[PDB]
């Protein structure tokens, strides 16, 4: 019942390790313990009451790139700890929980001799502590938005950066693990990459995010809905804010929109600014920002 904001850049020119959450009983953020590792564009979700910090950049001058690595904090502890690492490097990627396992979707490989945007999609199992490659997706998609509903798991807009392709996506798709197959389904209305997502009242929201297509909307503050009974896209009450490589997460059955980046006149605005929408009013409001800006962040409630 804490909402946890792990990781991320700060462009105002530095990749976090930091980790701070969110009381909305007293509207207050609080830092935490760090992670062992840098990183930007990182995955999180909570599986057994333990929060993962999957995989991410590190661009600060070192010997790190994107990381397949993977660690695991207790708030009992208070500290994070290695568990191991994905299968692929993996920035931008989309982390969800389904049947007691951790999923990987996505993400890109910017290593030396990676170089490329990914459709594989891998699992983690905490009683066996290893990774395994599962069924790949139609699409590549880094800053791919990723959630869990009705025991399916999405894989929502997104970017193929391959070279030749270079592509912003509203395509979603849609994977089984009782077939191990993923199929694509109702497209959203808005081309997102860098989207949150996240599942409030069965419904799944994808909240801002980019649109990079030639002459598009760059970035975004419009959130759209997907109701799997009707597989189909609504647009709802916009953010306050566009939100780039945005963080989300629902507590309290309020859906937050946490961090971001916006353009600005001299590039990009990196946001500490947080906010929150109620689906019985259709409405977002800002609560207290983070002390810390980060876009890139991974999101998660514990």
């Known amino acids: 019942r804490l909402l946890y904001a792990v990781g991320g850049y700060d462009g105002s020119h530095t990749h976090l390790n930091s980790v701070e959450c969110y009381d909305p009983e007293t509207n207050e953020w609080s830092l935490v313990a760090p992670m062992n590792t840098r990183r930007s564009g990182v995955g ?18 070192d010997g790190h790139t994107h990381l397949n690595s993977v660690e695991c904090y207790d708030p009992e502890t208070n500290e994070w700890s290695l568990v191991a690492p994905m299968n692929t490097r993996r920035s931008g990627v989309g982390v969800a929980v389904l049947n007691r396992l951790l999923y990987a ?46 025991r399916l ?10 070279p030749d392709g270079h592509t912003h ?42 649109d990079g297509s030639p002459d598009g909307h760059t970035h975004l503050n419009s959130v759209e809905c997907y109701d799997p009974e009707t597989n189909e896209w609504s647009l709802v009450a916009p953010m306050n804010t566009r939100r780039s490589g945005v ?15 916006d353009g600005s006149p001299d590039g990009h605005t990196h946001l500490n600014s947080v906010e929150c929408y109620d689906p019985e009013t259709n409405e977002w409001s800002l609560v207290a920002p983070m002390n810390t800006r980060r876009s890139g962040v991974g999101v998660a409630v514990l």
């Open 44 to 61: 999180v979700a909570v599986l057994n009451r333990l929060l993962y910090a999957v995989g991410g950049y590190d661009g600060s001058p």
């Open 247 to 261: 963080g989300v997460a629902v507590l309290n059955r309020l859906l937050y929109a946490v961090g971001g980046y």
């Open 169 to 210: 996506l509203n395509s979603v798709e849609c994977y089984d693990p009782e077939t191990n197959e993923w199929s694509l389904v109702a497209p959203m209305n808005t081309r997102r990459s860098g989207v949150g997502v996240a599942v409030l009242n069965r419904l799944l929201y994808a909240v801002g995010g980019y």
């Open 105 to 150: 979707v996505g993400g890109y490989d910017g290593s030396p001799d990676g170089h490329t945007h990914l459709n594989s999609v891998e699992c983690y199992d905490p009683e066996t502590n290893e990774w395994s490659l599962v069924a790949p997706m139609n699409t590549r998609r880094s800053g791919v938005g990723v959630a869990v509903l009705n």
């Open 153 to 162: 798991l999405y894989a929502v807009g997104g970017y193929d950066g391959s």
